[PDB]
């Protein structure tokens, strides 16, 4: 039996994609060692059915710990944004423990995420083949990589233009980009990517050309589940079909009080029904739902609005018939889920790869992006406008139509989605066994 150790990045969204990939390799007669911090393994084990206990084994990775950076903060999930540099640094310092795990378990293959250049380095030193699995899309990577080589040539196939807010943000930055691209470039033989050709095919081909690496799509990797929901469904069941937006900014972003004000006033002016997940970082004692929102906002919204604190059953909400839209930060898993369930996206991207994802959503026609003003600020009138058009007044039915067509395409895919990955792993291991 071929054994695979998988090392995701310490983000819930990355962990989620890695587990869905682990299940698929499970079903193709691979044994999976799933390695992350204990706080991350605690958050992900509930998502793994008991049927995989003999196929998927969780392995603990130790990060350096301090009373001020204790193990329960060894994740991006709810992490204070000012601790994100410490988490990246602590993660790199787990290379020694990672090497000892590889020597103890001696897996035949390492599948590693895009945010740990030390991981392929440790694997090569132990003569273990290592493959990058990139849990996000193609579009960002190629849109970012093209202007470095061809600053005077227009990006092919797209009309997307990056807003000056993110062009300044990503102008330290060089070091993180070089680290990110290294984990793709150093992958052996192929890069596995969490995307599908119906959405990004021509960008996958172009990226393979820019990187001089073979790119293998592993498809949309969407988790589908089988306390919170009961109360929420009772509220949603009283609404009209396709009348309600879900509002979420992911697992590792906390909008500013001023950003929340623009989102809230946009929801108010649109008169839509809404369910809004409001989260606070793990150390915040000073913040609350009423304080975080404009005064009187929820009493003006009345029964049109519901605020969920902490965490919501995102997939179940997106699948409810009353959901007509998704006001989302356009994290990659959120985008894949919304297409899988046929829900139009109202893009409010925030940072990293989200502004690119929003561009791709807009280009694919399965959603619309709320544009920021020239200074990079979210605009309550743009949010209200798009919710009105897409959900309330329904003058943008092309977006619903194309999202539903995309969901039928995705629902039609099966385990053949993983044939190309499995054949490339097979070939790589057969070749590396000869070279010893
Ligand atoms: C800096 C370098 C890796 C950084 C890495 O540096 C490596 O680090 C290793 C050591 O690892 C460290 O040591 C460990 C322990 O030992 C750990 O402790 C620790 O964590 C770990 O960091 C060393 O062994 C390596 O020697 C060293 O390079 C770090 C420091 C992050 O790691 C990164 C990797 C990606 C990269 C390699 C690019 C991607 C691909 C391309 C080139 C441009 C030229 C090519 O593009 C083509 O050409 C164009 C025109 O030219 C187009 O025309 C054409 O379309 C296009 O196709 C092409 C394909 C090569 C890059 C854009 C290039 O710009 C430099 C890039 C960012
Ligand atoms: C293609 C790359 C530009 C390449 C170019 O980078 C630019 O190059 C410019 C000039 O480069 C110099 O000149 C050239 C020619 O002149 C070279 O020849 C020369 O070698 C070089 O020195 C610099 O001016 C710029 O500063 C520099 O950005 C190179 C490297 C080729 O250089 C572009 C730029 C922005 C980028 C780097 C992203 C922004 C930030 C993030 C990553 C995703 C992963 C990371 O986000 C993580 O993921 C989250 C989870 O999703 C969080 O959980 C987690 O916490 C978070 O950390 C993080 C922070 C890295 C990106 C979204 C990544 O998807 C693609 C990236 C678009
Ligand atoms: O209240 C919430 C917020 C997020 N999620 C899940 O957390 C993941 C977020 O991943 P994404 O890539 O969209 O954004 P990230 O949090 O990584 O920035 C998705 O699978 C969501 O379904 C959820 O279930 N409930």
Establish whether residue 181 lines the binding site of ligand 1, counting it when its CB lies within 6 angstroms of any ligand atom: yes
Q: Which two tokens stand for residue 332?
A: 């990659």
Spacing, Cα 178 to ligand 1 middle (Å)? 6
CA separation for the pair 101, 104 (Å, rounded): 5
Cβ pair 368, 400 in contact under 8 A: no
Query: Rounded to whole angstroms, what are the CA distances from 30 to 36, 58, 102, 426?
Result: 19, 14, 17, 11
Ligand 1: distance of its center to the CA of 185 in Å? 7
Radius of gyration of the chain (CA): 22
Structure tokens given for 218 = 């592993």
Burial string for 237-271 (b: 16+ CB within 10 Å, else e) reads eebeebbbbbbbbbbbbbbeeebbbbbbbbbbebe
Active-site residue list:
14, 113
Q: Are 370 and 347 contacting, i.e. CB atoms less than 8 angstroms apart?
A: yes
The CA-atom distances, in angstroms, between 280 and each of 3, 36, 251, 256 are: 39, 24, 10, 11
Coil vs helix vs strand at 61? coil
Give yes or no for residue 16 CB within 6 A of ligand 3: yes
**How were these coordinates obtained?**
X-ray
Mutate which of 174, 182, 186 for ligand 2 pocket (most atoms within 8 A of beta carbon): 174
| Token code pair at residue 266 | 């946009």
Q: Which two tokens stand for residue 96?
A: 């020694």
In the three-class reduction of DSSP (H, G, I as helix; E, B as strand; rest coil), residue 141 is classed as: helix
Cβ–ligand 3 distance for 353 under 6 Å, the answer: no
Dihedral of the alpha carbons of 123, 110, 220, 308, in degrees to the nearest 10: -80
Sequence-ordered list of residues with C-beta below 8 angstroms from that of 352, at least 6 positions apart, any chain: none
Task: Give me 181's structure tokens.
Answer: 């691209």
What SS3 state is found at 243?
A: coil
In words, the CATH class of domain 2-219+413-435 is alpha beta
Query: Is the Cβ atom of 174 under 6 angstroms away from ligand 2?
Result: yes
- Give residue 182 CA to ligand 2 midpoint distance, Å: 11
How far apart CA 11 and CA 44 sit, in angstroms, is 11
Q: For domain 228-411, which architecture applies?
A: 3-Layer(aba) Sandwich (3.40)
**Is any ligand 1 atom within 6 A of the Cβ of residue 212?**
yes
Q: Rounded to 10 degrees, what is the CA torsion of 108, 109, 110, 111?
A: -150
Closest ligand to 96 CA? 1
Nearest Cα residue to atom 17 of ligand 2: 148
Q: Which residues are CB-contacts of 76 (< 8 A; sequence separation ≥ 6)?
A: 10, 11, 12, 84, 87, 251, 252
Q: Please report which ligand is nearest the Cα atom of 279.
A: 3
Q: Residue 7: how many CB atoms within 10 A of its CB?
A: 29
Largest CA distance in the chain: 70
Outline which parts of the chain fall under CATH 3.40.50.2000.
2-219+413-435, 228-411
The protein residue whose alpha carbon is closest to atom 54 in ligand 1 is 210
Ligand 1, atom 38: closest residue by C-alpha: 181
Q: Among candidates 339, 357, 164, which has minimal Cα distance to 249?
A: 357
Tell me the structure's resolution in angstroms, rounded to a single decimal: 2.3
Mutate to test the pocket of ligand 2, among 177, 200, 351, 358 (most ligand atoms within 8 A of CB): 177
Is residue 333 within 8 A of residue 17, CB to CB? The reply is: yes
Q: How far apart are CA 18 and CA 261, in angstroms?
A: 35
Q: What are the Cα distances from residue 373, in Å, to 30, 163, 262, 342? A: 50, 9, 12, 29
Contact present, 190 and 431 (Cβ < 8 Å)? no
Query: Which ligand ends up closest to the CA of 148?
Result: 2
Distance, in Å, from the CA atom of 321 to the CA atom of 325, rounded to the nearest integer, reads: 11
287 close to 114: Cβ distance less than 8 angstroms: no
Contacts of 27 (CB under 8 A, 6+ apart): 415
The residue whose CA has the least distance to atom 10 of ligand 3 is 13
């Amino acid at each position: 039996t071929t054994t695979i150790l998988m090392l995701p990045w310490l983000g819930y969204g990355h962990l989620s994609a890695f587990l869905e990939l682990a299940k698929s390799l499970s079903r193709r007669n691979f044994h999976i060692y799933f390695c992350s911090t204990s706080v991350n393994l605690d958050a992900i084990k509930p998502k793994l059915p008991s049927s995989f206990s003999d196929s998927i084994q969780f392995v603990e990775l130790h990060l350096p710990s301090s009373p001020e950076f204790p193990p329960h903060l060894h994740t991006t999930n709810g992490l204070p944004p000012t601790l994100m540099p410490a988490l990246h640094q602590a993660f790199s310092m787990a290379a020694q423990h990672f090497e000892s795990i590889l020597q103890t378990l001696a897996p035949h293959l390492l599948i590693y995420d895009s945010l740990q250049p030390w991981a392929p380095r440790v694997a090569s030193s132990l003569k273990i083949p290592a493959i990058n699995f990139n849990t996000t899309g193609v579009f960002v990577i190629s849109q970012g990589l093209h202007p470095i080589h061809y600053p005077h040539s227009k990006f092919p196939f797209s009309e997307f233009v990056l807003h000056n807010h993110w062009k300044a943000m990503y102008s330290r930055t060089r070091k993180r980009g070089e680290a990110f691209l290294y984990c793709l470039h150093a992958s052996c033989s192929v890069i596995l990517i969490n995307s599908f050709r119906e959405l990004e095919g021509k960008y996958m081909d172009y990226l393979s050309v820019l990187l001089n690496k073979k790119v293998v799509p592993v498809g949309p990797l969407v988790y589908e589940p089988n306390e919170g929901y009961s109360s929420i469904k009772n509220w949603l069941d009283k609404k009209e079909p396709s009348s309600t937006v879900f509002v979420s900014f992911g697992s590792e972003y906390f909008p500013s009080k001023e950003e929340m004000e623009e989102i809230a006033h946009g929801l108010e002016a649109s008169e839509v029904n809404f369910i809004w997940v409001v989260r606070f970082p793990q150390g915040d004692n000073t913040s609350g739902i009423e304080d975080a929102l404009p005064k009187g906002f929820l009493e003006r919204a009345g029964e049109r609005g519901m605020v969920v604190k902490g965490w919501a059953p995102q997939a179940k909400i997106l699948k409810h018939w009353s959901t007509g839209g998704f006001v989302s930060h356009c994290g990659w898993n959120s985008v894949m889920e919304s297409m899988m369930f046929g829900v139009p996206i109202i893009g409010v991207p925030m940072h990293v790869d989200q502004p690119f994802n929003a561009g791709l959503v807009e280009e694919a026609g399965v959603g619309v992006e709320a544009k920021r003003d020239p200074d990079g600020k979210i605009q309550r009138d743009e949010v209200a406008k798009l919710i009105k058009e897409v959900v309330v007044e329904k003058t943008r039915e092309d977006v619903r139509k194309k999202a539903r067509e995309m969901s039928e395409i995705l629902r039609s895919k099966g385990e053949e989605k993983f044939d190309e990955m499995v054949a490339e792993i097979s070939l790589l291991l057969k070749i590396e066994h000869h070279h010893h």
